[PDB]
Amino acid sequence: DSFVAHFREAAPYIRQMRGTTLVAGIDGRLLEGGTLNKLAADIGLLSQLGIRLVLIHGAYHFLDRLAAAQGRTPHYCRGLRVTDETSLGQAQQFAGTVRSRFEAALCGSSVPLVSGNFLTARPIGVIDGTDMEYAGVIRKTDTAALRFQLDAGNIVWMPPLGHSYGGKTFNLDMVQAAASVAVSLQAEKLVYLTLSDGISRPDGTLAETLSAQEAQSLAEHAASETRRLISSAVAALEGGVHRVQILNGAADGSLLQELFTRNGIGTSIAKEAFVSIRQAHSGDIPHIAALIRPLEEQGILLHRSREYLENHISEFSILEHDGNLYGCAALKTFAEADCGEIACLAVSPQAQDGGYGERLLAHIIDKARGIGISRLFALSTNTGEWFAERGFQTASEDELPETRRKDYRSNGRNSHILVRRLHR
Amino acid sequence: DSFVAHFREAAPYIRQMRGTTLVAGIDGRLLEGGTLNKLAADIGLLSQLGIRLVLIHGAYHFLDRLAAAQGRTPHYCRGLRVTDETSLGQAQQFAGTVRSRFEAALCGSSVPLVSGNFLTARPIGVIDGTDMEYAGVIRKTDTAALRFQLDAGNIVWMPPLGHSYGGKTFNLDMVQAAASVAVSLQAEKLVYLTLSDGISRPDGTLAETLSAQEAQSLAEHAASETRRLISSAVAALEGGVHRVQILNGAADGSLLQELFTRNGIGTSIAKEAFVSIRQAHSGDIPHIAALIRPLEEQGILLHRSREYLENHISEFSILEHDGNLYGCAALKTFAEADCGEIACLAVSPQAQDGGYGERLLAHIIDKARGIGISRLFALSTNTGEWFAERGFQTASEDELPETRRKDYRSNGRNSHILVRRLHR
Amino acid sequence: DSFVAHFREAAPYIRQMRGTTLVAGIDGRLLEGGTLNKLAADIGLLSQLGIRLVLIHGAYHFLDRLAAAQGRTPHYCRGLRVTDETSLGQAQQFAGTVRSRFEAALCGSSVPLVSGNFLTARPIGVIDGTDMEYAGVIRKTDTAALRFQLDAGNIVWMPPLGHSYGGKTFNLDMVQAAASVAVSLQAEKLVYLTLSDGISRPDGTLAETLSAQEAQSLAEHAASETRRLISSAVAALEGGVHRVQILNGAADGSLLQELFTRNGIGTSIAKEAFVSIRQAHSGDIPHIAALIRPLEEQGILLHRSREYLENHISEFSILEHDGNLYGCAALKTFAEADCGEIACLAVSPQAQDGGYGERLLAHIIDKARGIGISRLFALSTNTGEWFAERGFQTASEDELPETRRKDYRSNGRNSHILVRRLHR
Amino acid sequence: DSFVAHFREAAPYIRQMRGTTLVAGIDGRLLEGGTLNKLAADIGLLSQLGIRLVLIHGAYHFLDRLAAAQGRTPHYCRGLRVTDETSLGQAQQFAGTVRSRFEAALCGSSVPLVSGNFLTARPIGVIDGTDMEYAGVIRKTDTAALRFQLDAGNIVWMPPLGHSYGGKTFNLDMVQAAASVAVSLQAEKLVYLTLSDGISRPDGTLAETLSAQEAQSLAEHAASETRRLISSAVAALEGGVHRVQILNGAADGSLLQELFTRNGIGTSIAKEAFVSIRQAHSGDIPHIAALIRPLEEQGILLHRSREYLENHISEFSILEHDGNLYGCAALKTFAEADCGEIACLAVSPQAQDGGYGERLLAHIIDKARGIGISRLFALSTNTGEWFAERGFQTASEDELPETRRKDYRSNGRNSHILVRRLHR
Ligand SMILES: CC(C)(COP(=O)(O)OP(=O)(O)OC[C@H]1O[C@@H](n2cnc3c(N)ncnc32)[C@H](O)[C@@H]1OP(=O)(O)O)[C@H](O)C(=O)NCCC(=O)NCCS
Ligand SMILES: CC(C)(COP(=O)(O)OP(=O)(O)OC[C@H]1O[C@@H](n2cnc3c(N)ncnc32)[C@H](O)[C@@H]1OP(=O)(O)O)[C@H](O)C(=O)NCCC(=O)NCCS
Ligand SMILES: CC(C)(COP(=O)(O)OP(=O)(O)OC[C@H]1O[C@@H](n2cnc3c(N)ncnc32)[C@H](O)[C@@H]1OP(=O)(O)O)[C@H](O)C(=O)NCCC(=O)NCCS
Ligand SMILES: CC(C)(COP(=O)(O)OP(=O)(O)OC[C@H]1O[C@@H](n2cnc3c(N)ncnc32)[C@H](O)[C@@H]1OP(=O)(O)O)[C@H](O)C(=O)NCCC(=O)NCCS
Ligand SMILES: CC(=O)N[C@@H](CCC(=O)O)C(=O)O
Ligand SMILES: CC(=O)N[C@@H](CCC(=O)O)C(=O)O
Ligand SMILES: CC(=O)N[C@@H](CCC(=O)O)C(=O)O
Ligand SMILES: CC(=O)N[C@@H](CCC(=O)O)C(=O)O
Numbered sequence A, B, C, D: 001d002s003f004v005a006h007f008r009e010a011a012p013y014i015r016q017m018r019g020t021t022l023v024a025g026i027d028g029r030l031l032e033g034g035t036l037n038k039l040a041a042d043i044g045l046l047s048q049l050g051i052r053l054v055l056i057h058g059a060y061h062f063l064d065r066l067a068a069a070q071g072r073t074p075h076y077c078r079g080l081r082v083t084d085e086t087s088l089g090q091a092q093q094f095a096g097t098v099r100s101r102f103e104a105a106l107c108g109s110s111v112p113l114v115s116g117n118f119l120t121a122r123p124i125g126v127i128d129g130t131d132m133e134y135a136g137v138i139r140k141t142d143t144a145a146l147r148f149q150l151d152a153g154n155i156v157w158m159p160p161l162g163h164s165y166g167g168k169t170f171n172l173d174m175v176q177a178a179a180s181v182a183v184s185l186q187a188e189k190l191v192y193l194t195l196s197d198g199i200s201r202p203d204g205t206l207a208e209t210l211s212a213q214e215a216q217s218l219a220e221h222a223a224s225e226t227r228r229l230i231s232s233a234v235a236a237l238e239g240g241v242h243r244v245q246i247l248n249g250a251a252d253g254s255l256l257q258e259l260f261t262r263n264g265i266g267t268s269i270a271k272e273a274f275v276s277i278r279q280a281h282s283g284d285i286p287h288i289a290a291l292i293r294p295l296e297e298q299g300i301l302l303h304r305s306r307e308y309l310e311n312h313i314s315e316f317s318i319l320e321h322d323g324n325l326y327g328c329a330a331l332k333t334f335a336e337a338d339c340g341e342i343a344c345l346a347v348s349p350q351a352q353d354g355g356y357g358e359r360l361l362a363h364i365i366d367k368a369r370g371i372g373i374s375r376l377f378a379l380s381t382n383t384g385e386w387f388a389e390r391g392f393q394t395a396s397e398d399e400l401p402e403t404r405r406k407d408y409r410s411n412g413r414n415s416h417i418l419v420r421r422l423h424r
Helices: A003-017 A035-048 A060-070 A087-107 A143-151 A174-185 A212-219 A224-239 A254-260 A282-298 A306-315 A356-370 A384-388 A402-411 B003-017 B035-048 B060-070 B087-107 B143-151 B174-185 B212-219 B224-239 B254-260 B282-298 B306-315 B356-370 B384-388 B402-411 C003-017 C035-048 C060-070 C087-107 C143-151 C174-185 C212-219 C224-239 C254-260 C282-298 C306-315 C356-370 C384-388 C402-411 D003-017 D035-048 D060-070 D087-107 D143-151 D174-185 D212-219 D224-239 D254-260 D282-298 D306-315 D356-370 D384-388 D402-411
Strands: A021-026 A052-057 A113-116 A119-123 A135-141 A155-158 A161-163 A169-172 A189-194 A209-211 A243-248 A267-270 A276-279 A316-321 A324-332 A339-347 A375-380 A416-421 B021-026 B052-057 B113-116 B119-123 B135-141 B155-158 B161-163 B169-172 B189-194 B209-211 B243-248 B267-270 B276-279 B316-321 B324-332 B339-347 B375-380 B416-421 C021-026 C052-057 C113-116 C119-123 C135-141 C155-158 C161-163 C169-172 C189-194 C209-211 C243-248 C267-270 C276-279 C316-321 C324-332 C339-347 C375-380 C416-421 D021-026 D052-057 D113-116 D119-123 D135-141 D155-158 D161-163 D169-172 D189-194 D209-211 D243-248 D267-270 D276-279 D316-321 D324-332 D339-347 D375-380 D416-421
Touching: A003 A254, A003 B003, A003 B035, A003 B254, A021 A035, A021 A174, A035 A052, A035 A087, A035 A254, A035 B003, A052 A143, A052 A174, A060 A087, A087 A113, A087 A161, A087 A169, A087 D087, A087 D161, A087 D169, A113 A143, A119 A169, A135 A161, A135 A174, A143 A155, A143 A174, A161 D087, A169 D087, A174 A189, A174 A224, A189 A224, A189 A254, A209 A212, A212 A224, A212 A267, A224 A243, A224 A267, A243 A254, A254 B003, A276 A356, A282 A306, A282 A316, A282 A324, A282 A339, A306 A316, A306 A324, A316 A356, A324 A356, A339 A356, A356 A375, A375 A384, A384 A416, A384 C119, B003 B254, B021 B035, B021 B174, B035 B052, B035 B087, B035 B254, B052 B143, B052 B174, B060 B087, B087 B113, B087 B161, B087 B169, B087 C087, B087 C161, B087 C169, B113 B143, B119 B169, B135 B161, B135 B174, B143 B155, B143 B174, B161 C087, B169 C087, B174 B189, B174 B224, B189 B224, B189 B254, B209 B212, B212 B224, B212 B267, B224 B243, B224 B267, B243 B254, B276 B356, B282 B306, B282 B316, B282 B324, B282 B339, B306 B316, B306 B324, B316 B356, B324 B356, B339 B356, B356 B375, B375 B384, B384 B416, B384 D119, C003 C254, C021 C035, C021 C174, C035 C052, C035 C087, C035 C254, C052 C143, C052 C174, C060 C087, C087 C113, C087 C161, C087 C169, C113 C143, C119 C169, C135 C161, C135 C174, C143 C155, C143 C174, C174 C189, C174 C224, C189 C224, C189 C254, C209 C212, C212 C224, C212 C267, C224 C243, C224 C267, C243 C254, C276 C356, C282 C306, C282 C316, C282 C324, C282 C339, C306 C316, C306 C324, C316 C356, C324 C356, C339 C356, C356 C375, C375 C384, C384 C416, D003 D254, D021 D035, D021 D174, D035 D052, D035 D087, D035 D254, D052 D143, D052 D174, D060 D087, D087 D113, D087 D161, D087 D169, D113 D143, D119 D169, D135 D161, D135 D174, D143 D155, D143 D174, D174 D189, D174 D224, D189 D224, D189 D254, D209 D212, D212 D224, D212 D267, D224 D243, D224 D267, D243 D254, D276 D356, D282 D306, D282 D316, D282 D324, D282 D339, D306 D316, D306 D324, D316 D356, D324 D356, D339 D356, D356 D375, D375 D384, D384 D416
Parallel strands: A021 A052, A021 A189, A052 A155, A113 A155, A119 A161, A135 A169, A189 A243, A209 A267, A339 A375, B021 B052, B021 B189, B052 B155, B113 B155, B119 B161, B135 B169, B189 B243, B209 B267, B339 B375, C021 C052, C021 C189, C052 C155, C113 C155, C119 C161, C135 C169, C189 C243, C209 C267, C339 C375, D021 D052, D021 D189, D052 D155, D113 D155, D119 D161, D135 D169, D189 D243, D209 D267, D339 D375
Antiparallel strands: A113 D113, A119 A135, A161 A169, A243 A267, A276 A316, A316 A324, A324 A339, A375 A416, B113 C113, B119 B135, B161 B169, B243 B267, B276 B316, B316 B324, B324 B339, B375 B416, C119 C135, C161 C169, C243 C267, C276 C316, C316 C324, C324 C339, C375 C416, D119 D135, D161 D169, D243 D267, D276 D316, D316 D324, D324 D339, D375 D416
């Protein structure tokens, strides 16, 4: 495929990723092989594409490679590596040689790269009667300082080391350092660059996209390591991060291909914000009426009525928060078994603009589909593009279900008509 | 070829083009067909890639399309279209419908797009007894205002219309408006988006790259239109612009492919700054000595001598400005007919850092090559990377011409040795 | 009258209008005659006087002038002109020739003038079974971009055209575009430059100033056009704009004379914020007591008492929001039928500083006046200037009603005394 | 001595050192002992006192401590340590453990500390037939980036490592890295924190202050190490740095005591800018006349004359640049052998304000003193404070030498009279 076409494809993801903040937690194996030059390069490019970068690396696998081979053996607890004064000493060494090679590798393939005492750690203390010693976790993170450097366009490099006010240095767990740093920054995107093609489902297939929930539920049968990715990824999301990804950093160019294709090459994970949508029943009707009535008076909605509603209350859905009714949507059906209609779609003007409408539309389309409906219509007098923009084609009178074509004729409204093909 | 590989290729040109200013002069035919959506898109992307954009369009072909078809016939003079009060009136119309379609087309494929009274025109007046009437040329261009908008990241749109202080509006020639605007902005790059795959040489082949000189000399036998491109492109360059390009705007994605590949798809043109390099002769020697001597005292250069030089003054070149000697370089030869050496390469410390060294290196390599030399050596004690960076590989003692290997041994200097393969 | 005196008069309105934002909706007839040079000039001056300017123009009258004269006839619906693909095409033309003439006219009488894709439209869709086609209304307005340009001192020019995300361009109604833009900007002032000396009352007299309410009520018997001015002017105000004006843009210099004289030459309209003020009755007394008591303990208010109040509860007014009592004020009377006193004026410290005090003062003065009172006194120990500033002159003991002069003597407070002449 | 008095003493040096840039080159032994906490603390304080800090550390002594103890033995050349791929590897380790301890030590005694890829090195190459291998020197130093961080108030930390464009990392000599960095920054002050109480004179006494010249001349008989301090300190100065100091970083609190006392505790070094001052002779007189005459016409100088001057040309000095005469000053003597007068002090108005006047004053006072003069008078009608400010006390008529008191009386000028006691 041609250059121009690849470039024209990436264009939209470049748009999206621009001026946005991307926290990367990098396995330290990656900072060592031939795999490091590829990765620094891909990261220069990101910088070039106007993405704000914070980069954090781990040390566990290097330490052990030095441990097992010193005679000693590392214990982990809940995953967290007990770190003594000698391991801590090597982690300080490992960080200097890494930060320096990554620098060279980046300078060799004028991109400004900045490191900082942005972190204050406290020791994790004791877990299940075990002194973790120098194992830290982040107590404070100098957010203003960081934004300042990202504002200026510097790529931030962070080793897995914080300092405490007592003048002691602690060893930080990369995986949950990064996620903590992302939540501080409210970064749009946390990326973990592992040695694995993402997270696998119950049977060997790699999980392309997952809700925090699905992620959660894969964990019960998942391996230590991928279990802790999942929790930090879940916590990063609930903490405000928009999207956390898992890639194989060792696979050539994966970062690019993940960020700037319609496809990807790893797992990505997203949080399903709260919205209780359910089958309307007898009690909603006064609410729905109050919601519906203003609109049905402006001419934006067909005029309904207590009995209309009372007798079709089953074809309606409502969206609710805290007992409060914020929206509704109904599915009409027809003698044509393939057809359907989104009807009576309404969100309160107060609670508008946060994807409520969308959620009801989606919901209905799930329901139209569970009954073998494959074309969904939507007619509208002042709102057509909401649907044109969200996957509906223009249609004519002659295309409606026969009956709906009758009503349409003797409406007098001339609503615009649209449809959207639903998928099996 | 894979995505990642295309992207990894563009990466360097993205680096270069970033934060840089690109003035585009666009034929107005392009703002009309299906060719406009492609082009707006490609231009959104540029914006996305951090390039400062100023865009200017023409009107000549639209006017005439309206003229010939009104009964009237346009005269041009030296290429400049006499424009009456009615043509001027239509150009104002044409500009509003263009700026608005390009807007829609860009909004449809959140990129900020800004238009401005940045130009003050005066009428061209009379040429060869002919009143050009409303044909303007730019008298002043509000540069601070423009930088301000580019600083903020707006894409600047400019119609081919300026206003004069007497309250009159003039019609501007696109081709030399853009080049004028670029010189004001000192833009790095002026791009002309024509209906032609660039400029053709004496025999049908498209001229990939050209010096302003070669450009110049193609003009004597070239067609009106491409003659005026050439002059404005020459004037833009001498006026300070770094590089002017000519592409076919109608060819799909050409802009991208031009800017972000090692290849291209149009013509590009560059100015050969002034440097008089010539065969050293008897008179230079005191100069060369003064230049050479400090260095030959620090140990950076083999030690020469009046007679050494006097008897080999033919193997030397010198670089000179205003009778002043600013650098030198010599080509040694050997019993091996394929071999050569760059020797005695020196630029004054005052006049360093502007590509003087490079120019002498190049020069010598032209000369080594005109005598069938295909490997050029360079030995150096403190300056090796200058050559490693500029296309030389490391070598060993055992690889030198036999004689030079002798001298090398009984030097005691241990110079590093490098070579570079010259091309037929 | 002398220069200096005119200038010294304008000085205060210049103070007020400085650094303030003024959205102007301009009838497009104005952009055409000799009336355009005058108007551009007056608008340069505004810019010179440090006023932030956004200017938006209409197209309806031009379109029709082209329509009726093409054979075709425009339908309007609720005032909104159905606009086809050919009208939309001309509106794009009309905008380019206008923006360009206004530019020339402004450049001819160095004031920076900036145009922008600040608007995203959606089509109005269908009204009363009628496809409005390309008739848009503004869906989003890039407010940050606009403030940015106004911050820099540019005059913003806006044609009556937005674009939609589907890549289509819509025709915008000027009158309610401007008001929408003002509300976005929260501009202090929206000015509509019409062809009429403002809005006329029930009997031929031009309405100098009006509350949104009075405006509203003039509408029931008013003409289509002036009916829609009124609604957009009402909506702009409720939407947050401080003041909307209606002038005759064709009348020479009206804009100046409107903005910088104590008088004006058109209609102006202002919103009466919410304040329920009413006759105190038996139930308020505990509230009034709690409000009054702290103050009556600091020495700022004469000391009252349950019975005092109980027996004069008729001379009191209270101000209330949401059943909450936020202030009070009483009118005392005297054997002198011309006299009155503002007594017991108090607002809670929480709800202070928003013109509550003023509203009660006003209120009382309405009431003093409805009983033929023409001098209102106010005595005060620590608050005299509140009244000196708000239209009261200093007075002496010997000027009080005889009885109040008695009380004053044997007070011991030495309150300052002031008065204000009320008008028939 | 009391707190207040110490603080009131430091106040002036705090004034001077504020907002000023201080580059510190630190021996790496210092980053290790108990000596590190003291030093980080003193450096926090500096930061607190508004001084811009760049800090750079060495590695030579650590490397060798690892070398001698590995079996290997380091060669130095001209002082520069040949560094192989394994030493370079350890220097990367040493830098990470240092930067991290200094961090902890600073965090333990909220001061922001910033590290950066500010340096690009090239290898030193070959010296006297010896491959220095990975021994670098700085080729480019990102000055804008550095000022940016100092502007923001960050303390800059720099390890002794740069990177080259070929993707290789080099080992930098601390001593001449710092001085190079200072010259780039044009820092006011370069401080070298050694293990020695400054530089010793020919006989064991520590050299408090030295001109670059005196420094220079101490070097001929000085030890390798202190020889290279001297050259880098000389080059930093000629390169534009205002003042370079040498202290014992291991001595407790020396940095403070050096910077904020009238005394110090180490050596300091300063450059004697160019000014040729010499005994006036017959040829200067026309110059001196032209210089003198305007002034002698304004009344600022006693009126002289060709013969006056011709016959006393020995009591005059002149200051000259490039054969050009820019100033003059004369010493009068008296029957009182202790007395003297500065007479005829004049600098051209063009070349004023750069300490020329001062230099002539000094000069004369050297000359008055070499003839046993211990009081120097200066009389002046419009210039008294120049002398009051520069160490002269007010005097009366009755205090002048007897003869000068005569002239003074029958002048009519009433010059102010001042004196200054010169020291044996
Ligand atoms: C259309 C509606 C139901 C969407 O509800 P919502 O919860 O705001 O929906 P979402 O937040 O998912 O989408 C909001 C977005 O849709 C856009 N939208 C809202 N009204 C629009 C319209 N009439 N035309 C086009 N787009 C519109 C909003 O501008 C907003 O744009 P953005 O994505 O660039 O911010 C709307 O809120 C509503 O109730 N309008 C009046 C009732 C109506 O038209 N109902 C049925 C139509 S037949
Ligand atoms: C090498 C030299 C001749 C280049 O001359 P020049 O006119 O400055 O050459 P150019 O301007 O084309 O190239 C200058 C660039 O080369 C780089 N350069 C200069 N000396 C360098 C060196 N010793 N090592 C690596 N790069 C060096 C400069 O840093 C500058 O870097 P930049 O491209 O990132 O700005 C140099 O100026 C010189 O005379 N040095 C001393 C003499 C010497 O070494 N002569 C022969 C070497 S065997
Ligand atoms: C005087 C008072 C009743 C005004 O109430 P209010 O609702 O704040 O009145 P407004 O908001 O219309 O006017 C507020 C302004 O009046 C000014 N004002 C308030 N107290 C003032 C005083 N004692 N002297 C002068 N001006 C005063 C406020 O500073 C504010 O100034 P600004 O216009 O530059 O912002 C005041 O709030 C109050 O109750 N003070 C104590 C009670 C008292 O003095 N009552 C009667 C006086 S005899
Ligand atoms: C006084 C003079 C000789 C000093 O020469 P100079 O080379 O400028 O001396 P310096 O640069 O060392 O000192 C310059 C400073 O002295 C100050 N100075 C100059 N004239 C001054 C005066 N008349 N009163 C007080 N200070 C003065 C300048 O303002 C400048 O102030 P700064 O230290 O805050 O910048 C002056 O330049 C001069 O020639 N003035 C007229 C001739 C004259 O008065 N000669 C003899 C006086 S009896
Ligand atoms: C999608 C939607 O809510 N449609 C409106 C009908 C609009 C019309 O038919 O013209 C409804 O009443 O269901
Ligand atoms: C390229 C160059 O100028 N070389 C130096 C030689 C350096 C050496 O041989 O060690 C020259 O004298 O020609
Ligand atoms: C205006 C007002 O509220 N006055 C205070 C009286 C102040 C006085 O008389 O000194 C009042 O009690 O009515
Ligand atoms: C210091 C100096 O130059 N003095 C002036 C004299 C000023 C006076 O005596 O009043 C001089 O002629 O020497």
